[PDB]
Amino acid sequence: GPHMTSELQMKVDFFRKLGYSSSEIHSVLQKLGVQADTNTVLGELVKHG
């Protein structure tokens, strides 16, 4: 409850610090969702970005 870790959130906040764009991460994540993976995420940026 008080410490409800939002994995879905950290997923974006992570790459957000790597030096990417919020519109980029939030996008791929907005289309991928939770099914996405640490690999898929990177790939998306490798091509889209």
Short mmCIF file of C-alpha atoms in Angstrom, two decimals:
data_model
loop_
_atom_site.label_atom_id
_atom_site.label_comp_id
_atom_site.label_asym_id
_atom_site.label_seq_id
_atom_site.Cartn_x
_atom_site.Cartn_y
_atom_site.Cartn_z
CA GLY A 1 0.00 0.00 0.00
CA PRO A 2 2.33 2.74 1.30
CA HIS A 3 5.27 1.17 -0.54
CA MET A 4 3.38 -0.08 -3.60
CA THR A 5 6.25 -0.36 -6.09
CA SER A 6 5.07 0.65 -9.55
CA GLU A 7 7.12 -1.57 -11.86
CA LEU A 8 5.31 -0.15 -14.89
CA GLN A 9 6.48 3.29 -13.78
CA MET A 10 10.09 2.41 -12.95
CA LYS A 11 10.22 0.86 -16.42
CA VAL A 12 10.13 4.35 -17.94
CA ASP A 13 11.89 6.26 -15.16
CA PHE A 14 14.82 3.91 -15.78
CA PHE A 15 15.58 4.58 -19.44
CA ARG A 16 14.54 8.16 -18.69
CA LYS A 17 17.84 8.54 -16.84
CA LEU A 18 19.85 6.59 -19.41
CA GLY A 19 19.65 9.70 -21.56
CA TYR A 20 16.56 8.97 -23.64
CA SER A 21 13.47 11.07 -24.35
CA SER A 22 10.30 10.81 -22.26
CA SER A 23 8.23 10.87 -25.45
CA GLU A 24 10.34 7.97 -26.73
CA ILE A 25 10.18 5.69 -23.70
CA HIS A 26 6.61 6.60 -22.76
CA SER A 27 5.71 5.83 -26.38
CA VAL A 28 7.22 2.36 -26.77
CA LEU A 29 5.89 1.55 -23.30
CA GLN A 30 2.46 2.96 -24.14
CA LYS A 31 2.25 0.57 -27.09
CA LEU A 32 4.11 -2.37 -25.57
CA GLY A 33 2.63 -2.31 -22.08
CA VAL A 34 3.66 -4.89 -19.49
CA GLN A 35 4.35 -7.67 -21.98
CA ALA A 36 7.44 -5.74 -23.06
CA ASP A 37 10.89 -6.91 -21.97
CA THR A 38 14.29 -5.44 -21.10
CA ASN A 39 15.38 -6.56 -24.56
CA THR A 40 12.36 -5.41 -26.57
CA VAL A 41 12.59 -1.96 -24.98
CA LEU A 42 16.19 -1.48 -26.11
CA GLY A 43 15.46 -2.78 -29.60
CA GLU A 44 12.61 -0.30 -30.00
CA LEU A 45 15.03 2.56 -29.35
CA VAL A 46 17.70 0.94 -31.52
CA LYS A 47 15.39 1.26 -34.52
CA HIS A 48 12.84 3.95 -33.67
CA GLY A 49 15.63 5.98 -32.10
#
